Amino acid sequence: PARSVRHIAIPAHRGLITDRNGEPLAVSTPVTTLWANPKELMTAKERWPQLAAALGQDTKLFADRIEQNAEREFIYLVRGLTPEQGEGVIALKVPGVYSIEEFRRFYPAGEVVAHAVGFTDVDDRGREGIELAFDEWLAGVPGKRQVLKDRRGRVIKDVQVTKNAKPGKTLALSIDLRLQYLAHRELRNALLENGAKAGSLVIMDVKTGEILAMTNQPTYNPNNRRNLQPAAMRNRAMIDVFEPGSTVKPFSMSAALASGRWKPSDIVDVYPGTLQIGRYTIRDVSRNSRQLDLTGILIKSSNVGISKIAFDIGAESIYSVMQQVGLGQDTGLGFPGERVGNLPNHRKWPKAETATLAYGYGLSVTAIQLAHAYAALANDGKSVPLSMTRVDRVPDGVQVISPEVASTVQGMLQQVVEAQGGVFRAQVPGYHAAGKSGTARKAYRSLFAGFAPATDPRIAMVVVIDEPSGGLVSAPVFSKVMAGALRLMNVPPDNLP
Numbered sequence: 366p367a368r369s370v371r372h373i374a375i376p377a378h379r380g381l382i383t384d385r386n387g388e389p390l391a392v393s394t395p396v397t398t399l400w401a402n403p404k405e406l407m408t409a410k411e412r413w414p415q416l417a418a419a420l421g422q423d424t425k426l427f428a429d430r431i432e433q434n435a436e437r438e439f440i441y442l443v444r445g446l447t448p449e450q451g452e453g454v455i456a457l458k459v460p461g462v463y464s465i466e467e468f469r470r471f472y473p474a475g476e477v478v479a480h481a482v483g484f485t486d487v488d489d490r491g492r493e494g495i496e497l498a499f500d501e502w503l504a505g506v507p508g509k510r511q512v513l514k515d516r517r518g519r520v521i522k523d524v525q526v527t528k529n530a531k532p533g534k535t536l537a538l539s540i541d542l543r544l545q546y547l548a549h550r551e552l553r554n555a556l557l558e559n560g561a562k563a564g565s566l567v568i569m570d571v572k573t574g575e576i577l578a579m580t581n582q583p584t585y586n587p588n589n590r591r592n593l594q595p596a597a598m599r600n601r602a603m604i605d606v607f608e609p610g611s612t613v614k615p616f617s618m619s620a621a622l623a624s625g626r627w628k629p630s631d632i633v634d635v636y637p638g639t640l641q642i643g644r645y646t647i648r649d650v651s652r653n654s655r656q657l658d659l660t661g662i663l664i665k666s667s668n669v670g671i672s673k674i675a676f677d678i679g680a681e682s683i684y685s686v687m688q689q690v691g692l693g694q695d696t697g698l699g700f701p702g703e704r705v706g707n708l709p710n711h712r713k714w715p716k717a718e719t720a721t722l723a724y725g726y727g728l729s730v731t732a733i734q735l736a737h738a739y740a741a742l743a744n745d746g747k748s749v750p751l752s753m754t755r756v757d758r759v760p761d762g763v764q765v766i767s768p769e770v771a772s773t774v775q776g777m778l779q780q781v782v783e784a785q786g787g788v789f790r791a792q793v794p795g796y797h798a799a800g801k802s803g804t805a806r807k808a809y810r811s812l813f814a815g816f817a818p819a820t821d822p823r824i825a826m827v828v829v830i831d832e833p834s835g836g837l838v839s840a841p842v843f844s845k846v847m848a849g850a851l852r853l854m855n856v857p858p859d860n861l862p
Contacts, residue, residue, distance in 0.1 A: 375508030380533030384542040393468040397451030399442040404517040405461025438518030484587040505533035537755040539575035548578040560834030565602040567736040574749035610803035611666040613725040620682040635669040642716040668724040675723035680714035689765035690738035739825040743816035746771030779819040790840035802836020813839035
C-alpha cells in the first residue's frame with residue numbers, strides 16, 4: 366500500500382497484588398524493551414555491527430537474523446532492560462531501532478510466597494497461583510488506537526484512541542506476609558533438622574475461612590525462573606494427595622458422639638492390638654492396651670478401637686461427616702492443577718472398608734482440605750468457605766457438626782496434646798493447643814493437624830513433612846509456627862492461673 370491505517374493495542378497496567386495488610390506481593394514495573402523495523406534496518410547495514418555489539422550478539426548471527434526477516438515490520442531485539450541500557454542503545458540512533466516501556470511483574474517477597482502468588486508469562490498473563498486464578502481481575506482491558514503507517518510500516522501519525530486501556534484492579538490476598546515468613550522459615554528449618562526432602566504448611570482463620578499462610582518446600586524465586594524445575598514449582602499443599610490416617614479419626618469420633626450411642630468416658634477393649642475381619646487384619650501401631658476410653662483411642666491412635674466404634678455406628682455416619690467438612694471435595698479456590706482427592710462412597714459398607722475409612726486409609730485428601738476440615742471442627746462445628754482473598758464480610762457458612770459434639774471433640778484433641786502419653790511436643794507455650802498426628806504411606810509423610818487456642822479457637826494448621834530420617838516430627842513445627850502465629854495476631858493466652 367501507498368499508506369495503511371492500522372490497529373494498535375494499548376497494554377493495560379496489571380493490578381497490584383497485596384497481602385491482607387496491603388504489603389506488595391506482585392507489582393507491574395516499567396521495563397525498557399528495544400524493538401526494530403527490519404525494512405528500515407536494511408537501509409542502514411553499516412550500523413548493524415555497532416547495534417549487534419551493543420546487544421552482545423555475534424555480528425554474523427545478528428546480520429543473518431535481520432536478512433532472514435527483511436520482509437517484516439517488527440522483531441523484538443531485547444526485553445527487560447533498565448532505562449540506562451535503553452538510552453545506551455537509542456544513543457546509537459540506528460534507523461528502525463525503537464525503545465518502549467513494557468510492564469513486567471516484580472515479586473518483592475520472592476520465594477517466600479511463590480506458590481500462592483505464582484507468576485506471569487512473557488505476554489504478562491498468569492501462568493501459576495493467584496496470577497492465573499485471578500488473571501481476568503488483574504489483567505484489565507487492553508486499549509486500542511488508530512495509527513497511519515508508510516510503505517515501510519512505521520507510525521507516521523496518531524489518528525485517535527478508539528478505546529481507552531482499562532487498568533487491572535488491586536487484589537488483597539488473605540495471606541498475612543508476616544505469618545507466611547514465619548511459616549516458610551520454620552518449615553525450612555524442620556526439613557533440615559528432620560532430614561526431609563519436601564513439606565507444606567497451611568494456616569487458616571477458623572472464623573473467616575481465610576488462608577493466612579500457605580508455604581511449600583522446596584520453593585523457587587519467581588523473579589529468576591531460568592533454571593526451572595517442576596519439583597520446586599509444585600504447589601504441594603493444593604496438589605499432593607495422601608491418605609490422612611489418624612488425622613481424620615476426630616471426624617470418626619464426631620460421628621460416634623452424634624450417633625447417641627457413645628460418650629467420651631465409654632470404653633472399648635482393643636486387646637490384643639489386632640482384629641481379624643474376614644481375610645483382613647486391622648493392626649494397631651501400639652499393642653500394649655486392653656480397655657481404652659474414646660480419648661485414649663485418639664491418644665494411642667488405636668485402629669482397632671476406632672474400627673469397633675465404626676462397626677457400631679456404621680460407615681454411613683462417618684462418610685457423611687467427612688463429606689460435610691469437605692474431605693475429597695472441590696475447595697472452590699480455582700488454583701491450577703488443584704486436586705480434589707477421593708472420598709469413596711458405597712451403598713453397602715463391608716467391615717474392611719468401614720474400618721479403613723474410620724482410621725483414615727479409605728480416602729485421599731490435600732493439606733488444604735484437611736486444614737479446612739480442622740477449621741470447621743475448631744469453629745464449633747461451622748464450615749466457612751475457603752478464601753485466598755481478604756474476607757471483609759464473612760459468609761454465613763454451614764453447621765456441619767453440632768456445637769456440643771464439636772466442643773467435646775476439641776476437648777479430646779486438647780487432651781491428645783496435654784494428657785500423659787499424649788503428643789507433648791505439640792503443646793503451645795501460652796495457650797491450650799488441640800490436634801492429632803498421623804502418618805500417610807508413600808517412605809511416608811509425617812502429618813500434624815490442629816488448632817488453638819483450645820477453649821476459644823482462632824487458627825487451624827496442617828504440617829506435612831514428606832520422608833523424614835512419624836507424626837512426632839510435625840508436632841514441634843506446629844508448636845513453633847502456632848505460638849508465632851497467635852502472637853503476630855495478638856491473640857491472648859487461655860492457660861492462666
